[PDB]
Scaffold this active site. Structure first.
Site, PDB file in Angstrom:
ATOM      1  N   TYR A  24       0.813  -1.222   0.000  1.00 40.27           N
ATOM      2  CA  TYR A  24       0.000   0.000   0.000  1.00 40.27           C
ATOM      3  C   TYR A  24       0.860   1.291   0.000  1.00 40.27           C
ATOM      4  CZ  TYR A  24      -3.938   2.979   1.600  1.00 40.27           C
ATOM      5  OH  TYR A  24      -4.900   3.958   1.715  1.00 40.27           O
ATOM      6  N   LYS A  50       0.983   4.135  -2.905  1.00 39.08           N
ATOM      7  CA  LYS A  50       0.637   5.515  -2.551  1.00 39.08           C
ATOM      8  C   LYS A  50       1.813   6.498  -2.674  1.00 39.08           C
ATOM      9  CE  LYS A  50      -3.797   4.862  -1.493  1.00 39.08           C
ATOM     10  NZ  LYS A  50      -4.896   5.348  -2.384  1.00 39.08           N
TER      11      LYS A  50
HETATM   12  N1  LIG Z   1     -10.152   5.385   5.181  1.00 40.36           N
HETATM   13  C1  LIG Z   1      -8.954   5.715   5.407  1.00 40.36           C
HETATM   14  O1  LIG Z   1      -8.501   5.737   6.659  1.00 40.36           O
HETATM   15  C2  LIG Z   1      -8.014   6.107   4.300  1.00 40.36           C
HETATM   16  C3  LIG Z   1      -6.796   6.664   4.663  1.00 40.36           C
HETATM   17  C4  LIG Z   1      -5.895   7.050   3.688  1.00 40.36           C
HETATM   18  C5  LIG Z   1      -6.238   6.865   2.356  1.00 40.36           C
HETATM   19  N2  LIG Z   1      -7.408   6.325   2.002  1.00 40.36           N
HETATM   20  C6  LIG Z   1      -7.671   6.183   0.566  1.00 40.36           C
HETATM   21  O2  LIG Z   1      -8.935   6.750   0.226  1.00 40.36           O
HETATM   22  C7  LIG Z   1      -9.491   6.075  -0.903  1.00 40.36           C
HETATM   23  C8  LIG Z   1     -10.897   5.597  -0.563  1.00 40.36           C
HETATM   24  O3  LIG Z   1     -10.805   5.041   0.738  1.00 40.36           O
HETATM   25  P1  LIG Z   1     -12.056   4.451   1.547  1.00 40.36           P
HETATM   26  O4  LIG Z   1     -11.526   4.264   2.941  1.00 40.36           O
HETATM   27  O5  LIG Z   1     -13.224   5.387   1.294  1.00 40.36           O
HETATM   28  O6  LIG Z   1     -12.260   3.025   0.831  1.00 40.36           O
HETATM   29  P2  LIG Z   1     -13.598   2.099   0.782  1.00 40.36           P
HETATM   30  O7  LIG Z   1     -14.603   2.541   1.817  1.00 40.36           O
HETATM   31  O8  LIG Z   1     -13.093   0.678   0.724  1.00 40.36           O
HETATM   32  O9  LIG Z   1     -14.145   2.424  -0.692  1.00 40.36           O
HETATM   33  C9  LIG Z   1     -13.361   2.043  -1.825  1.00 40.36           C
HETATM   34  C10 LIG Z   1     -14.048   2.485  -3.108  1.00 40.36           C
HETATM   35  O10 LIG Z   1     -13.235   2.090  -4.212  1.00 40.36           O
HETATM   36  C11 LIG Z   1     -13.987   1.230  -5.065  1.00 40.36           C
HETATM   37  N3  LIG Z   1     -13.124   0.201  -5.669  1.00 40.36           N
HETATM   38  C12 LIG Z   1     -12.417  -0.748  -5.029  1.00 40.36           C
HETATM   39  N4  LIG Z   1     -11.775  -1.480  -5.957  1.00 40.36           N
HETATM   40  C13 LIG Z   1     -12.068  -0.985  -7.171  1.00 40.36           C
HETATM   41  C14 LIG Z   1     -11.695  -1.322  -8.467  1.00 40.36           C
HETATM   42  N5  LIG Z   1     -10.865  -2.358  -8.718  1.00 40.36           N
HETATM   43  N6  LIG Z   1     -12.183  -0.603  -9.497  1.00 40.36           N
HETATM   44  C15 LIG Z   1     -13.014   0.431  -9.282  1.00 40.36           C
HETATM   45  N7  LIG Z   1     -13.400   0.776  -8.046  1.00 40.36           N
HETATM   46  C16 LIG Z   1     -12.936   0.071  -6.981  1.00 40.36           C
HETATM   47  C17 LIG Z   1     -15.080   0.649  -4.198  1.00 40.36           C
HETATM   48  O11 LIG Z   1     -16.225   0.258  -4.942  1.00 40.36           O
HETATM   49  P3  LIG Z   1     -17.288  -0.791  -4.355  1.00 40.36           P
HETATM   50  O12 LIG Z   1     -18.189   0.067  -3.516  1.00 40.36           O
HETATM   51  O13 LIG Z   1     -17.936  -1.344  -5.596  1.00 40.36           O
HETATM   52  O14 LIG Z   1     -16.472  -1.789  -3.567  1.00 40.36           O
HETATM   53  C18 LIG Z   1     -15.403   1.807  -3.284  1.00 40.36           C
HETATM   54  O15 LIG Z   1     -16.372   2.669  -3.901  1.00 40.36           O
HETATM   55  C19 LIG Z   1      -8.556   4.917  -1.202  1.00 40.36           C
HETATM   56  O16 LIG Z   1      -7.726   5.263  -2.319  1.00 40.36           O
HETATM   57  C20 LIG Z   1      -7.750   4.746   0.068  1.00 40.36           C
HETATM   58  O17 LIG Z   1      -6.471   4.152  -0.189  1.00 40.36           O
HETATM   59  C21 LIG Z   1      -8.310   5.950   2.941  1.00 40.36           C
END
Ligand SMILES: NC(=O)c1ccc[n+]([C@@H]2O[C@H](COP(=O)([O-])OP(=O)(O)OC[C@H]3O[C@@H](n4cnc5c(N)ncnc54)[C@H](OP(=O)(O)O)[C@@H]3O)[C@@H](O)[C@H]2O)c1
Ligand SMILES: NC(=O)c1ccc[n+]([C@@H]2O[C@H](COP(=O)([O-])OP(=O)(O)OC[C@H]3O[C@@H](n4cnc5c(N)ncnc54)[C@H](OP(=O)(O)O)[C@@H]3O)[C@@H](O)[C@H]2O)c1
Ligand SMILES: NC(=O)c1ccc[n+]([C@@H]2O[C@H](COP(=O)([O-])OP(=O)(O)OC[C@H]3O[C@@H](n4cnc5c(N)ncnc54)[C@H](OP(=O)(O)O)[C@@H]3O)[C@@H](O)[C@H]2O)c1
Ligand SMILES: NC(=O)c1ccc[n+]([C@@H]2O[C@H](COP(=O)([O-])OP(=O)(O)OC[C@H]3O[C@@H](n4cnc5c(N)ncnc54)[C@H](OP(=O)(O)O)[C@@H]3O)[C@@H](O)[C@H]2O)c1
Lengths: 247, 244, 247, 244
Positions: free
Chosen positions: B154, B158
């Protein structure tokens, strides 16, 4: 009009708001709802600030290197408006020279005005912010603080110092709802920059964007960090430099 | 008002069915953009269409599938014209200490979190360059800058996102396109959904998790006309967890 | 014995070499062939330095905040040894406090001693280095300069300032064969650190290496940067902190 | 002397037939390490065996091939025991502006410059962890930190290297293994072999290209016992081209 980036109810203190970046910051914060106090080094400068701010704030004369002036101005602000919610440390100067030509005075004037001022002004507003569990401190730094620049070792030391100060204060006060950040402009169209044909073309040659920044573009980054929406940003340096430097 | 106004802009936000992606899509719509958000399933796409209403629509997309990307972009272009704002939010985690990390856990992360950004950015760039206006905003992570044990894959992806970002910013800045990264700290989402949170919180000076809306706000800011002089930047939104 | 990391023929000035890191730097530079001048704030400290350096250098009394002292010490060095090739700005202090308790004196003492000193000492040796088209300036910074730390906003501002100063001087003098770098130690086993059970365990909890650094480990990074082999390194900050912070 | 002494250490330096990799292998040998260097062809491997002489040997290795990596590591372990110092130097460029960048130019870079480091680091780590001593040193690039137009793929990989580095440093620091990156500026090699150099040189305050020996020196330094308190770091060796 909306609830987005809305500074209604906030008191903002913008140092060095008579022109350029400081003026743009003051104007935008007022546009977003803030009661704004802009400062200049003279009463006529203060008056010019009052004139552009109208019913949304006023101008005050401030010398950021004089603790007596600082105490006078904050007492005046707090009486009329209440505690400062947003402090923007924009006041600053340059005293350029290659090291071998740089005077003791040129070094110490930069330290005092560009670095020690931020210690005094920040210390002066922090208690009220900690008490309310809400505050913004935003320092106007420079790409030079991070990049370095020949002929500006003093300025660069002071602007880099502002980042070290910011990170530490950020840690000190984060649990009490106060953020502390720096906005670092690259080369912005200002009186300073309005240089001969050769020099502008030379600096511009190092900007991928191929233009100087506008003061309003710095104002926007400051307004963003000042907002409720930026509560989870602290200890950060937000670079606004057209790609001149990338960290 | 005219401030932070995205009226007339077409925004593509990948992974917009929940969490950060949904907060981004909703806010871009509220600021006036025509928003297309994506999920991996049609019922996800439908739920996006449902919350966007007349401000945009939902499409099914797998960002690791060239033919899907091409199909979604043709759909968007046919109906709305070319993409003005690209938000690469879709991303996954496949956590493991290195000695337990499978080939597929490394590669799924590279494909989903890094190569996807190459493919999608490439797909929208020509239009932004010809128009001399554009925004590509990548959703990175504090982990890309700080590192984290158990997340070497990851973190690699990133961090890679930022190298890509800096390079493309240089490539296209002269044509009025900005490329930036917003790096969230720990945000309350499904990805982060007692002792484990307390341990995370212990490293956050703010003493709380971030809200998805707080990431949305940073993205909206960089998407705006007012952020035209910001490019090649990584905007950290992490409660002081890390300070660069 | 070999041609690798060989400082034979180089004159090194190490400020604050009476103990800990400064002492380790002085000892290692001498071991690698340098004629070393270590400084302390008193003649007896200077004498203790002379005693450990023996035929490979000598101790001198120096106050880095006093330009008269600086001019005296460099004149003395240049007479006996010739121009300084390697300057290591190690002298420094802490004056810790949370911002609301921090005295004006505590701020200004840190600025003067930890930041303005580097301006004076660097300016004092640079001409000779530029003339010879060879020089090293290595500042001993701190992880706090980059990380920030609660209760050390003054120290952090000064140490961050050293980086801004370094980058700028690096640009000013790179074409003339002079490098300017910072070594930034994390928490090193020293008199300062030899804190109660709770505090050491607390800081150690933030070090992936799970131990304090040794002064010799800082000396090694300084010796590396001082070497001919490090000629293509300039404007850099070399972090030696056991993983406490990673940039 | 005892200073920067690598006697008793086994070093694996990938891509050691020429340039930076060769300067690294030669210097590690001069400081007393038993060195195994690699090239992509047997005649390359032989030339490495030839310049190392009794201080080590050359092996053929493709860092994008699991079976090659496994074969080379078994060979090394059988003869010399486990690897104490890993230098990931092997790397390529596949330059192009993004709109001209082929799928294979992105992927070859990811496989050769980033995934290779996952596979090789994983392959040597268990031994270093059990021994409670080890060094992994990645050869990055200023481009990973600075970005460069036409090299978005290379920058992505080299930035990714650093995210990986920071994560693994955290994972293994408590067991006495350090993980670091040396980031060269523009160094005189085959990869950099009038107007194009003048343009590069114009961005280097030092006003010259770096020597491969200068990169070797940084690598030898981090490989040493004396660098035990350096981990998760990126050591820039670029003549002031960039300053972090
Ligand atoms: N939450 C945190 O603490 C955090 C911290 C730092 C960075 N981030 C980053 O923020 C972004 C979103 O995070 P999140 O926490 O909101 O994640 P999440 O709740 O798991 O949501 C992920 C989203 O990406 C979609 N997705 C996953 N695989 C995909 C693929 N192969 N093709 C197209 N769409 C796909 C999912 O669609 P489905 O709904 O269909 O599964 C979902 O809409 C990510 O890039 C993550 O690395 C998050
Ligand atoms: N210009 C650029 O391209 C650029 C780029 C990066 C960063 N910056 C930074 O942005 C900030 C504002 O820049 P600018 O170029 O807009 O400045 P500017 O137009 O030169 O105006 C400077 C302001 O600071 C005030 N000031 C100076 N000394 C003061 C003192 N001792 N006490 C109180 N106020 C004092 C001045 O007051 P008076 O009006 O009374 O003189 C004035 O309002 C500065 O911190 C500067 O370092 C500028
Ligand atoms: N200790 C750590 O964990 C640590 C971590 C990161 C960075 N550092 C930095 O490393 C450097 C050395 O640290 P240390 O802990 O080894 O220091 P230390 O043991 O406390 O010794 C400080 C040295 O600086 C000299 N000094 C103090 N004020 C001076 C002045 N006004 N003029 C000239 N010399 C003066 C002292 O001289 P006398 O002998 O005459 O008193 C002494 O030799 C400092 O810059 C410090 O900030 C230390
Ligand atoms: N030169 C520069 O200006 C510069 C600047 C920054 C970073 N770097 C980095 O420094 C490292 C070496 O650079 P260089 O300029 O010395 O490169 P170089 O002269 O092209 O040498 C590359 C080495 O890597 C080997 N190699 C290539 N592909 C391989 C593969 N798939 N599997 C195993 N080995 C492979 C080559 O073996 P063969 O001999 O069999 O082809 C060769 O020994 C690279 O990681 C590069 O990104 C170089």
């Amino acid at each position: 009009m909306s609830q987005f980036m809305n500074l209604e109810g906030k008191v903002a203190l913008v140092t060095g708001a008579s022109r350029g970046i400081g003026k743009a910051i003051a104007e935008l914060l007022a546009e977003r709802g803030a009661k704004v106090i802009g400062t200049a080094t003279s009463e006529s400068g203060a008056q010019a600030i009052s004139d552009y701010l109208g019913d949304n704030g006023k101008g005050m004369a401030l010398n950021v290197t004089n603790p007596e002036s600082i105490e006078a101005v904050l007492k005046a602000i707090t009486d009329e408006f209440g505690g400062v919610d947003i402090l923007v440390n924009n006041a600053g100067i340059t005293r350029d020279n290659l090291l071998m030509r740089m005077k003791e005075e040129e070094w110490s004037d930069i330290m005092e005005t560009n670095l020690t001022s931020i210690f005094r002004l920040s210390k002066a507003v922090l208690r009220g912010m900690m008490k309310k569990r809400q505050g913004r401190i935003i320092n106007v730094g420079s790409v030079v603080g991070t990049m370095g620049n020949a002929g500006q070792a003093n300025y660069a030391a002071a602007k880099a110092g502002v980042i070290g100060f910011t990170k530490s204060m950020a840690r000190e006060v984060a649990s009490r709802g106060v953020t502390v950040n720096t906005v670092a402009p690259g080369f912005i169209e200002t009186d300073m920059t309005k240089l001969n044909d050769e020099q502008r073309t030379a600096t511009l040659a190092q900007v991928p964007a191929g233009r100087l920044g506008d003061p309003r573009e710095i104002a926007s980054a400051v307004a963003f960090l000042a907002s409720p929406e930026a509560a989870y940003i602290t200890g950060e340096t937000l670079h606004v430099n057209g790609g001149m430097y990338m960290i």
